[PDB]
RNA sequence: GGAUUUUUGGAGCAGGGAGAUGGAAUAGGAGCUUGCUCCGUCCACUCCACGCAUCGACCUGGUAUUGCAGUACCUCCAGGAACGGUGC
C-alpha cells in the first residue's frame, strides 16, 4: 500500500534519485536552489543529501548572485518548494 | 484605626503615570523596609491615592510616621493606616523582663493584647484596668516598654507601660 | 527515550524568543505536547514590559535557553 | 514524633501526625500547669481581685 | 476529540467577523461546524473606503477567522 | 560579613512590585560592594538597603542592572567607572547617605541612562543651589528627590555657572 | 524509512541548524525527540545582521528549523541501517 | 488527553485576563468559556490591540488558531499548579 | 442550523456562480461555477475566471481545481 | 500520527516622484592615480500627496475630583506631534 504508492506516485521521482544516484535540484522558499544527489528520503519529504551546491542572489541591503557547496546536509520537507529532476549527472 | 502592614497614602498628584508613581512609591518605601506589594489605581474612585504593604508592621509604622505630610510630586501626601488587611499579607500569613500596664480597657480580650504585643518578639506569658506582660528577652521587653509608652490603641483612654519592680 | 529534556529545565527561569523578534523571560512551570509554556512573572524585552503570568502558545516559539538560577 | 508504643502498626504520615496532635492535646490537658492554673489574690486591694493569674501577680508586685 | 466550538449561544445573532488580510464582515450566523466554518446570511462586508457591500449568504472558513464579536446581547 | 559568592547564592531573589527581578541583600552589613559576578546579570534590581558601603564602586559589567537601592548607608563617594559597568542604570536611590559635597555628584554625570535620582536626607542637599547644580551637572535625570524637573529649573541651572 | 530515528541517533555530534529567519545555531546535538526537539549544549547562534552569541544550552523546535548541516566525516551509510 | 496549560487556562475561567492575538489584538475581560482548543469566549470584553484601537464590546470570541499568548493573573500559580 | 457542507452541496446542485477570495491575498480572487466538492473543500470550477481588483481585469482559465487551504471566503453572485 | 486551532510553515520581496541640493575620513568601476565626467546602494532638509485617516502610550499650560483597593487604560480643554500597529 505505502510502498506501491511511494514507487508509483510522485515519490518515485524521489526514488529514482536514490536508486540510480542521479542529481536533482531543490528550490526552497528562501530563493535558494540546491543541486545534489538525494541519499535519504521519507514520507514527509525529509531529504538528506550529499555533495550539494546551493546558489542564490543577495542584495547589499546593484545586487549580486552567489553560490556555495556543502559536503552533506539535511533539509526538511516543509521548506522544500520545488523539486526538479534532470539528467545533469551525465 | 489599628496599625497594619499596609500604609495608605492619599492627596497625591494624579497627573503622573501609574507605573512611574508606583516606582516612586516603591523607591520611597524601600528606605524604611522591604515593600512586599504596592496597590495603586487611577480610576475615578481611587484617584490620587495608593498604598504600600510591607513584610513587617514596624517598617510600615516607621514609614507612616516619617513620611507623614511629605511633598510627593508637588503635593503633600497624607499617610495613614489601612482599614482592612491586604490580600497578599492574608495569603502569606495563612529595665526588666516583666512590664506593668496601667489604664487598660476592660473590653479588650487576650487576642487584642497578643496582637499588640506581637510587635515585640515571642514572650513568656500575659497577665490580665491593670495588666502584666513578661517577655523572654530583656531587650525585647525594653523595646516593648519604650514603644507602648503612649501607644495609639483605644483612643478614649491612654495606655501606660512601665517596668516592674523587685 | 527518557524524555528528560523538558523536565530538567522545570521551575527555572528561561528566556524564549518569539517569531516576531520578542523575548519573554519567565519561570517555566509546565509544558504539554503542543509546547505550551507557562511563564510566571515574565518580562518582555525587544524596552521592559510588565506582563506577569504569560501563557504563550507553542506555535509562536522559536528557541529557548536558560537565563539564570531558579528563585 | 517520638517512637512509642502508641505509634505502632501506623504506616501513613498524616495518620501519624493526627494521632500525635491528639496525644499532645490529651497529655498537655491532663498535666498540672501552675502558670495558667492558679488563683492568686494580690495585695493591690487585698480584699478583691482573686482572678489574678500567676503572671499578673508578679507584674503587680514588681 | 474533535469537539465543536461553543456557538450555540451566538445562533441567529448579528455578529461581526474579522478575516485575514484585514477583512471585516457583519451578519447573522445560521449554523455551526466543527471546522470553525460559519454561514452568514445577508452578510455585509466593509470595503477599504468605508462603504458596506451586501454579499448575501457567505461561508467563512476557520483557517482565516481572526475574531468574532457579537453585536447583540446574548 | 563581606559580600562574597556564597552570600549572593544564598540570598533571596524574587519579583518586586514593578515586575522586575530583585535580589534582597538587606541585613548583611557589607562594608564594600564586591563579588557581584555570581549573579551573571540575571537581576534587574539590586536591594542593598541597610548596609555599611562607603563607596559605590567595584561593580562588574551588568547590562541588566537598571535599579540600585543604596538607602540607609554611608556612601560618601561615587566611582568614575559607573558608566562602563552599568550602561542601563536608570534608577539610583541614594537617600540617607554620607554625601556632603557636590563634587561627589560629578562621576554621576556619566550615567546617560539615569533618570530617577534620590539625594534626600543628605548634607549635600542642604548646601546652597544643590538642586540647580544637580540639574546642570546631570541633564539626563528627569526626577530628582521625587520631584519632576521643569523648564524653569533647567533654565535657572543653565543660566548660573555657565 | 523514518527520518526521526536517524536524527535521534546523531547525538554527541557538532552540527549546525539554519532556521527560517536566517539564524544559524552551531552546536553539539545532545537531545532529539520524536517531534525533532533539538536540545544542544554550548551552542553559538548568529541571527540576521547580528552578532554571534554563545550559550551554554539551547532548545530549538522542529518546525522552526529550515535546514541542517552535518560534518563530512559522519557515517551516513552506517546510521541509515535500522 | 488534557494538557496542564490547558487545565490552567480552563481553571482560570471567570477572572479578569487578556488574550493577545498573532495580529496584536488583545481581548481583555472575564473568560466565560475556555475550551481545550484555546477557544476564548468572553462577555463584556474590551479590545486593546497593538494597533491601539481600544473599544468595548458585549461579547467577543477569539479562536486558538490566531491566538499568540494569554496574560492571566497570578492567583492560580501557587496551588494546585505546584508540581 | 444550516451546515456549511449542506450549503456547499446546495450551491453545487443549483450550479450558481460563486466568487472565492484567497487567503492573505485581497487583490485577486476567483469566480466560477462549483461542480463538485470533497472533504478537503476542493472546488472544481468550470469556466473559471481570475478577477484582479487592482487592475480591473478578468482572465479566464477554464476547469480549475482550487484547494480548500487557500479559499478564505466564498460568496454567491448573480452573474 | 504532512488536509482548517499548535510540529513538515502562505511564505518571500520592495519602500512614491523631482530638484544646477550635500557627504563615502580608510572601501566602486570606466575615460588605465591626483582634478573632472557618467552610472545599478543611505541619511538631513525642501516641494507635490507634512504619504493619508484612526486609536493607544507621551509633553506643556489651565482645570476638576480628597476618594480604603486589588487593576488591559482612566477627568476635560488646546497646541505639538519623538513612538506603536491597522487599511489604501
Curated annotation (Swiss-Prot), chain A:
Chief subcellular location: cytoplasm
UniProt entry keywords in alphabetical sequence: Acetylation, Cytoplasm, Isopeptide bond, mRNA processing, mRNA splicing, Nucleus, Phosphoprotein, Ribonucleoprotein, Spliceosome, Ubl conjugation
Gene Ontology CC terms: catalytic step 2 spliceosome; cytosol; extracellular exosome; methylosome; nucleoplasm; nucleus; pICln-Sm protein complex; precatalytic spliceosome
Listed GO biological process terms: 7-methylguanosine cap hypermethylation; mRNA splicing, via spliceosome; RNA splicing; spliceosomal complex assembly; spliceosomal snRNP assembly; U2-type prespliceosome assembly
GO MF terms held by the record: RNA binding
Compartments, record wording: Cytoplasm, Cytosol; Nucleus
Residue ranges constituting the Sm domain according to the UniProt record: 11-89
Something else known: In the autoimmune disease systemic lupus erythematosus, antinuclear antibodies are developed with Sm specificity.
Its job: Plays a role in pre-mRNA splicing as a core component of the spliceosomal U1, U2, U4 and U5 small nuclear ribonucleoproteins (snRNPs), the building blocks of the spliceosome. Component of both the pre-catalytic spliceosome B complex and activated spliceosome C complexes. As a component of the minor spliceosome, involved in the splicing of U12-type introns in pre-mRNAs.
Family, per entry: Belongs to the snRNP core protein family.
Protein's UniProt name: Small nuclear ribonucleoprotein Sm D2
UniProtKB/Swiss-Prot annotation, chain B:
Localization of this protein: Nucleus
InterPro entries assigned to the protein according to its UniProt record, in alphabetical order: Nucleotide-bd_a/b_plait_sf, RBD_domain_sf, RRM_dom, U2B''_RRM1, U2B''_RRM2
Mutagenesis or variant effect for residue 17 to Q: In a colorectal cancer sample; somatic mutation
Domain RRM: 5-84, 97-166
Alphabetized UniProt keyword annotations: Acetylation, Isopeptide bond, mRNA processing, mRNA splicing, Nucleus, Phosphoprotein, Repeat, Ribonucleoprotein, RNA-binding, Spliceosome, Ubl conjugation
A Pfam match: RRM_1
GO BP annotations, alphabetical order: mRNA splicing, via spliceosome; U2-type prespliceosome assembly
Cellular component GO terms held in the UniProt record: catalytic step 2 spliceosome; cytoplasmic ribonucleoprotein granule; fibrillar center; nuclear speck; nucleoplasm; nucleus; spliceosomal complex; U1 snRNP
PROSITE patterns: RRM (PS50102)
UniProt key word rRNA processing: no
Modified residues (Phosphotyrosine): 97
CDD domains given in the database record: RRM1_U2B (cd12478), RRM2_U2B (cd12481)
Recorded GO MF terms: U1 snRNA binding
Keyword Repeat: yes
General function of this protein: Involved in pre-mRNA splicing as component of the spliceosome. Associated with sn-RNP U2, where it contributes to the binding of stem loop IV of U2 snRNA.
Miscellaneous: Patients with systemic lupus erythematosus produce antibodies which interact with snRNP proteins.
Oligomeric and partner information: Identified in the spliceosome B complex. Identified in the spliceosome C complex. Present in a spliceosome complex assembled in vitro, and composed of SNRPB2, HPRP8BP and CRNKL1. Contributes to the binding of stem loop IV of U2 snRNA with SNRPP1.
Similarity-based family: Belongs to the RRM U1 A/B'' family.
Protein's UniProt name: U2 small nuclear ribonucleoprotein B''
Organism, as annotated: Homo sapiens (Human)
Curated annotation (Swiss-Prot), chain C:
Keyword NAD annotated: no
Regions annotated as coiled coil: none
Subcellular location: Cytoplasm, Cytosol; Nucleus
A GO CC annotation given for this chain: U1 snRNP
Acetylation among keywords: no
Sm domain ranges (all copies): 1-70
Its biological purpose: Plays a role in pre-mRNA splicing as a core component of the spliceosomal U1, U2, U4 and U5 small nuclear ribonucleoproteins (snRNPs), the building blocks of the spliceosome. Component of both the pre-catalytic spliceosome B complex and activated spliceosome C complexes. As a component of the minor spliceosome, involved in the splicing of U12-type introns in pre-mRNAs. As part of the U7 snRNP it is involved in histone pre-mRNA 3'-end processing.
Disease connection: Cerebrocostomandibular syndrome: A syndrome characterized by severe micrognathia, rib defects ranging from a few dorsal rib segments to complete absence of ossification, and intellectual disability.
Similarity remark: Belongs to the snRNP SmB/SmN family.
Note: Patients with the autoimmune disease systemic lupus erythematosus (SLE) have autoantibodies directed against some of the individual snRNP polypeptides. The most common autoantigen is called Sm. B/b' bear Sm epitopes.
Protein name, entry field: Small nuclear ribonucleoprotein-associated proteins B and B'
Organism the protein comes from: Homo sapiens
Protein's gene: SNRPB
Swiss-Prot record, chain H:
Quaternary structure and interacting proteins, as annotated: Core component of the spliceosomal U1, U2, U4 and U5 small nuclear ribonucleoproteins (snRNPs), the building blocks of the spliceosome. Most spliceosomal snRNPs contain a common set of Sm proteins, SNRPB, SNRPD1, SNRPD2, SNRPD3, SNRPE, SNRPF and SNRPG that assemble in a heptameric protein ring on the Sm site of the small nuclear RNA to form the core snRNP. Component of the U1 snRNP. The U1 snRNP is composed of the U1 snRNA and the 7 core Sm proteins SNRPB, SNRPD1, SNRPD2, SNRPD3, SNRPE, SNRPF and SNRPG, and at least three U1 snRNP-specific proteins SNRNP70/U1-70K, SNRPA/U1-A and SNRPC/U1-C.
Highest taxon, organism lineage: Eukaryota
Family statement: Belongs to the snRNP core protein family.
Keyword Nucleus carried by entry: yes
Gene Ontology cellular component list: catalytic step 2 spliceosome; commitment complex; cytosol; methylosome; nuclear body; nucleoplasm; nucleus; pICln-Sm protein complex
Main function: Plays a role in pre-mRNA splicing as a core component of the spliceosomal U1, U2, U4 and U5 small nuclear ribonucleoproteins (snRNPs), the building blocks of the spliceosome. Component of both the pre-catalytic spliceosome B complex and activated spliceosome C complexes. As a component of the minor spliceosome, involved in the splicing of U12-type introns in pre-mRNAs. As part of the U7 snRNP it is involved in histone pre-mRNA 3'-end processing.
Record carries keyword Acetylation: yes
Residues carrying N-acetylserine: 1
Domain Sm: 4-76
Main localization, broad class: cytoplasm
Amino acid at each position: 500500500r505505502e510502498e506501491e504508492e511511494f514507487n508509483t506516485g510522485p515519490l518515485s521521482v524521489l526514488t529514482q534519485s536514490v536508486k540510480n544516484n542521479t542529481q536533482v535540484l531543490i528550490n526552497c522558499r528562501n530563493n535558494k536552489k540546491l543541486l545534489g544527489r538525494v541519499k535519504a528520503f521519507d514520507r514527509h519529504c525529509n531529504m538528506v543529501l550529499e555533495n550539494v551546491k546551493e546558489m542564490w542572489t543577495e542584495v547589499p541591503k546593484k545586487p549580486v548572485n552567489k553560490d556555495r557547496y556543502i559536503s552533506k546536509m539535511f533539509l526538511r520537507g516543509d521548506s522544500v518548494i520545488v523539486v526538479l529532476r534532470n539528467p545533469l549527472i551525465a | 484605626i489599628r496599625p497594619n502592614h499596609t500604609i495608605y497614602i492619599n492627596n497625591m498628584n494624579d497627573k503622573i503615570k501609574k507605573e512611574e508613581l508606583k516606582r516612586s512609591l516603591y523607591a520611597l518605601f524601600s528606605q524604611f523596609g522591604h515593600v512586599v506589594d504596592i496597590v495603586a489605581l487611577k480610576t475615578m474612585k481611587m484617584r490620587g491615592q495608593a498604598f504600600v504593604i510591607f513584610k513587617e508592621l514596624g517598617s510600615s509604622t516607621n514609614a507612616l510616621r516619617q513620611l507623614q505630610g511629605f511633598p510627593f510630586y508637588g503635593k503633600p501626601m497624607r499617610i495613614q493606616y489601612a482599614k482592612t488587611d491586604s490580600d497578599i499579607i492574608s495569603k502569606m500569613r495563612g529595665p526588666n523582663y516583666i512590664l506593668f500596664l496601667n489604664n487598660l480597657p476592660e473590653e479588650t480580650n487576650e487576642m487584642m493584647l497578643s496582637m499588640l504585643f506581637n510587635q515585640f518578639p515571642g514572650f513568656k506569658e500575659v497577665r490580665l484596668d491593670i495588666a502584666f506582660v513578661e517577655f523572654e528577652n530583656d531587650g525585647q521587653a525594653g523595646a516593648a516598654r519604650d514603644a507602648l509608652q503612649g501607644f495609639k490603641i483605644t483612643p478614649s483612654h491612654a495606655m501606660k507601660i512601665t517596668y516592674a519592680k523587685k | 527515550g527518557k524524555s528528560s529534556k523538558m523536565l530538567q529545565h522545570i521551575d527555572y527561569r528561561m528566556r524564549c524568543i518569539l517569531q516576531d523578534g520578542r523575548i519573554f523571560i519567565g519561570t517555566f512551570k509546565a509544558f504539554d505536547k503542543h509546547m505550551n509554556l507557562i511563564l510566571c512573572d515574565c518580562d518582555e524585552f525587544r524596552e521592559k514590559r510588565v506582563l506577569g503570568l504569560v501563557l504563550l502558545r507553542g506555535e509562536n516559539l522559536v528557541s529557548m535557553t536558560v537565563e539564570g538560577p531558579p528563585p | 514524633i517520638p517512637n512509642t508504643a502508641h505509634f505502632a502498626n501506623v504506616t501513613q504520615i498524616e495518620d501519624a501526625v493526627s494521632l500525635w496532635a491528639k496525644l499532645k492535646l490529651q497529655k498537655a490537658s491532663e498535666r498540672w500547669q501552675p502558670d495558667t492554673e492558679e488563683e492568686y489574690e494580690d495585695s493591690s486591694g487585698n480584699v478583691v481581685n482573686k482572678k489574678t493569674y500567676e503572671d499578673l501577680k508578679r507584674q503587680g508586685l514588681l | 476529540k474533535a469537539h465543536p466550538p461553543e456557538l450555540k449561544k451566538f445562533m441567529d445573532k448579528k455578529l461581526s467577523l474579522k478575516l485575514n488580510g484585514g477583512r471585516h464582515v457583519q451578519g447573522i450566523l445560521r449554523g455551526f461546524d466543527p471546522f470553525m466554518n460559519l454561514v452568514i446570511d445577508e452578510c455585509v462586508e466593509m470595503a477599504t473606503s468605508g462603504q458596506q457591500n451586501n454579499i448575501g449568504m457567505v461561508v467563512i472558513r476557520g483557517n482565516s477567522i481572526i475574531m468574532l464579536e457579537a453585536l447583540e446581547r446574548v | 560579613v563581606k559580600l562574597t559568592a556564597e552570600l549572593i547564592e544564598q540570598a533571596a531573589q524574587y519579583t518586586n512590585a514593578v515586575r522586575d527581578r530583585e535580589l534582597d541583600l538587606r541585613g548583611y552589613k557589607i562594608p564594600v560592594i564586591e563579588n557581584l559576578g555570581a549573579t551573571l546579570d540575571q537581576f534587574d534590581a539590586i536591594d542593598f538597603s541597610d548596609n555599611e558601603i562607603r563607596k559605590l564602586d567595584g561593580f562588574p559589567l551588568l547590562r541588566r542592572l537598571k535599579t540600585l537601592l543604596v538607602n540607609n548607608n554611608r556612601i560618601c563617594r561615587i566611582g568614575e567607572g559607573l558608566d562602563q559597568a552599568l550602561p542601563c542604570l536608570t534608577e539610583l536611590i541614594l537617600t540617607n547617605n554620607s554625601l556632603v559635597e557636590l563634587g561627589d555628584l560629578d562621576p554621576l554625570a556619566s550615567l546617560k541612562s539615569l533618570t530617577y535620582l534620590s539625594i534626600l536626607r543628605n548634607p549635600v542637599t542642604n548646601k546652597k543651589h544643590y538642586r540647580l547644580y544637580v540639574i546642570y551637572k546631570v541633564p539626563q535625570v528627569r526626577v530628582l528627590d521625587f520631584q519632576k524637573v521643569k523648564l524653569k529649573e533647567r533654565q535657572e541651572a543653565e543660566k548660573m555657572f555657565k | 524509512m523514518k527520518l526521526v530515528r536517524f536524527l535521534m541517533k546523531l547525538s554527541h555530534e557538532t552540527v549546525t541548524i539554519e532556521l527560517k529567519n536566517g539564524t544559524q545555531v552551531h552546536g553539539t546535538i545532545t537531545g532529539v525527540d520524536v517531534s525533532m526537539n533539538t536540545h544542544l549544549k554550548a551552542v553559538k547562534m548568529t541571527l540576521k545582521n547580528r552578532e554571534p552569541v554563545q550559550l551554554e544550552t539551547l532548545s530549538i523546535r522542529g518546525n522552526n528549523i529550515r535546514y541542517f548541516i552535518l560534518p563530512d566525516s559522519l557515517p551516513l551509510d552506517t546510521l541509515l541501517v535500522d | 488527553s488534557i494538557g496542564v496549560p490547558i487545565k490552567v487556562l480552563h481553571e482560570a475561567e471567570g477572572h479578569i485576563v487578556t488574550c493577545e492575538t498573532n495580529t496584536g489584538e488583545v481581548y481583555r475581560g472575564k473568560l466565560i468559556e475556555a475550551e481545550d482548543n484555546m477557544n476564548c469566549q468572553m462577555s463584556n470584553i474590551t479590545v486593546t490591540y497593538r494597533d491601539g484601537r481600544v473599544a468595548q464590546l458585549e461579547q467577543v470570541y477569539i479562536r486558538g488558531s490566531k491566538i499568540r499568548f494569554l496574560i492571566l493573573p497570578d492567583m492560580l500559580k501557587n496551588a494546585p499548579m505546584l508540581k | 442550523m444550516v451546515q456549511p457542507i449542506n450549503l456547499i452541496f446546495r450551491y453545487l446542485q443549483n450550479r450558481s456562480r460563486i466568487q472565492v477570495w484567497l487567503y492573505e491575498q485581497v487583490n485577486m480572487r476567483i469566480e466560477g461555477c462549483i461542480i463538485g466538492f470533497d472533504e478537503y473543500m476542493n472546488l472544481v470550477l468550470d469556466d473559471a475566471e481570475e478577477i484582479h481588483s487592482k487592475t480591473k481585469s478578468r482572465k479566464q482559465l477554464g476547469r480549475i481545481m482550487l484547494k480548500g487551504d487557500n479559499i478564505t471566503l466564498l460568496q454567491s453572485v448573480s452573474n
